[PDB]
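hiii, so i know i said id send this last week but things got crazy w the move. better late than never?? heres the sequnce for the chain we talked about at the cafe, plus the structure i predicted for it. fair warning i was half asleep when i ran it
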Amino acid sequence: GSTEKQLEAIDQLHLEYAKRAAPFNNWMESAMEDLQDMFIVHTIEEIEGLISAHDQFKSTLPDADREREAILAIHKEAQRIAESNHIKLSGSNPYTTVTPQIINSKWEKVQQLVPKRDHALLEEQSKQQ
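okay and structure toks below
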């Protein structure tokens, strides 16, 4: 079995991985960035608006959550060949340098920052007016 074909057929799967992991890696980063940073508010409108940013987050989470699983759902086809045949992949991925753990643990980082911000938001908003 020519390795090139076993890589080529799953490289088109790497294609879909790179296509979906791309916005997801951007999303996780932007979210983690904002979630990491301590929010500063002046007026009450900003304190609620910041919470609205968590509102729409609580709705996107379950969707992007399944997205992470759907990304592994692409990798299962492209990885199973490497797990059965002694192929020679050039590292983790040719198009998108993301490992399953990197995307999963990044999600876990996003999730862990959710309550921290959700707590600070409500505490701050309750100390407002």
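btw The chain has three helices and no strands. thought thatd interest u
miss u guys!!
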